[PDB]
Amino acid sequence: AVNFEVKDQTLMMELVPERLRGETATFDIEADGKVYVEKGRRVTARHIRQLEKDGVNFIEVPVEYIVGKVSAKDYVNEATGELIITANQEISLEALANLSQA
Amino acid sequence: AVNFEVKDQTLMMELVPERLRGETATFDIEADGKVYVEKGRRVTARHIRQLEKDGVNFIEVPVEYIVGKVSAKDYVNEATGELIITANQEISLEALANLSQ
Amino acid sequence: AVNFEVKDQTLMMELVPERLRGETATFDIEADGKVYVEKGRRVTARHIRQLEKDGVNFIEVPVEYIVGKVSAKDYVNEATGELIITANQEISLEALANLSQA
Amino acid sequence: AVNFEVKDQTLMMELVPERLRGETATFDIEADGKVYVEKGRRVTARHIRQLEKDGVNFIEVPVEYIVGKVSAKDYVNEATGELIITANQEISLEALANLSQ
């Protein structure tokens, strides 16, 4: 009766800025379409303050993080997590009425 | 990646109590698990009073209503309709990770 | 714990082609991004066969149809209906864990 | 326009029965409404047998597991995880019509 097709997916976790400084980024440090540190760059003090200036409290993390395929990072808070799924939800009213009738 | 297993379904619509009184119900007149008048029975002034006392301004309407299998009624306002789907949304994190890669 | 933001919505209903011929379209007759008859045009035999050639068994109808704000049309099957909602579903894992903990 | 009222939630993960035997459970070992071993109890060879006989290859894991409040265990495979959200999806047809206009 209801099909749910995933078009995109993103995981976000709370930044711990005090642990990010000096890391070499293994994935782009980004939020809301803006990349603050490119993969392979070492995070500078300015990068930290640029995130802060923009009010970036959550950053993107690879979705694979949630199935254990990314070694855990001290610069995100493990007690947090926001999963955003963009989907096309197809609801058959006919099929629902048939569930209801039965 | 995401399955949506439907366990129950209903519409809800705003009630126009003036137009209900005197009619014979074609579906249970119901809200929040309480049935006020059963299908096949006449709606009394007492029923109308009970609905008002309980503050019932929306009632359940079968999803069949939306595909014409239950015919239209004056005492529910189609402009106000809601579809409530009770479901288990089964999200495969493995599948989402696969999609991300 | 879960927010569901609607980005787009479409209603589709099964076409009854035998009742569409000769109608003056009051909304574009379309499916899958292709407009077959523009609003205000009278539907010709060719339009019917063009829909058929493309296998168009369902057409778009204004969503308002489902709240009774479009007078019913004999050229769609009233016993049908497919509602497609494009949404951003935001799932707070933290909030869900808190529901679970409680 | 759409509210998603959560009524229950769990993860599920693939079980590695060899790594469970002998451990003391920190959450009920459970599938499809049957609890095999309660939180705080040791998993026996008999428990392992029961799981196998019932064909239980995925078990429930608390959502707390995903935010670190329940610590990681060798006997569930995080690569396989699912999140199952039981909810009432309340779709306002009035609101969808409003959005369409």
For chain C, counts of helices (H) and of strands (E): 3, 5
d(CA B90, CA B21): 43
Unique residue bearing structure tokens 């009010």:
A55
* Collapsed DSSP state (helix, strand, coil) of residue D86: strand
Chain C: nearest CA to A61, how far in angstroms? 14
Q: Do C64 and D101 touch (CB under 8 A)?
A: yes
CA nearest to A77 within chain D: D67
Tell me how the structure was determined: X-ray
Q: Count how many domains chain D has.
A: 1
Tokens of A38: 């490119």
What Å distances lie between residue D12 and C96, D34, D82, CA to CA?
A: 14, 14, 5
d(CA B96, CA A37): 25
Give me the residue from A3, A63, A96 closest to B96, CB to CB. Answer: A63
Chain B: nearest CA to C94, how far in angstroms? 16
d(CA B16, CA B14): 7
Resolution (A): 1.7
Burial (CB count within 10 angstroms: exposed 0-12, middle 13-18, buried 19+), residue C22: exposed
Tokens of A46: 């300015």
Asked if residues A36 and A50 have their Cβ atoms less than 8 Å apart, the reply is yes
B&D contacts, CB < 8 Å: 47
Tokens of A70: 């990314």
For residue B23, the number of C-alpha atoms closer than 13 Å in the C-beta half-sphere is: 19
d(CA B73, CA B60): 13
Sorted by sequence, the CB contacts under 8 Å of residue C10 that are 6+ apart come out as C60, C63, C83, C84
Asked if residues A43 and A37 have their Cβ atoms less than 8 Å apart, the reply is yes
For chain A, counts of helices (H) and of strands (E): 3, 5
Burial (CB count within 10 angstroms: exposed 0-12, middle 13-18, buried 19+), residue D71: exposed
For residue C30, the number of C-alpha atoms closer than 13 Å in the C-beta half-sphere is: 13
Q: Do C79 and B68 touch (CB under 8 A)?
A: yes
For residue A49, the number of C-alpha atoms closer than 13 Å in the C-beta half-sphere is: 3
d(CA D56, CA B92): 18
**Single-letter amino acid, residue D39:** K
d(CA B1, CA B97): 10
Pairing of strands B34-37, C29-31: unpaired
Helix (H) or strand (E) holding B9: strand B2-15
Sorted by sequence, the CB contacts under 8 Å of residue B8 that are 6+ apart come out as B85, B86
Chain B: nearest CA to D59, how far in angstroms? 14
Q: Do A6 and B2 touch (CB under 8 A)?
A: yes
What residues make up the domain containing C32?
1-102
Q: Do C85 and A92 touch (CB under 8 A)?
A: no
What Å distances lie between residue B87 and A14, A89, B10, C92, CA to CA?
A: 30, 13, 12, 18
Give me the residue from B3, B89, B100 closest to A62, CB to CB. Answer: B100
Sorted by sequence, the CB contacts under 8 Å of residue A32 that are 6+ apart come out as A56
Reference D42, options D59, D62, D18, D25; nearest CA is D25
Unique residue bearing structure tokens 């949404």:
C87
| C69-99 residues labelled b (16+ CB within 10 A) or e (exposed) | ebeebebbbbebbbbbbbbbbbbbbbbbbee
| D22-56 residues labelled b (16+ CB within 10 A) or e (exposed) | eeebebbbbbeeeebbeeeeebeeebbeebeeeeb
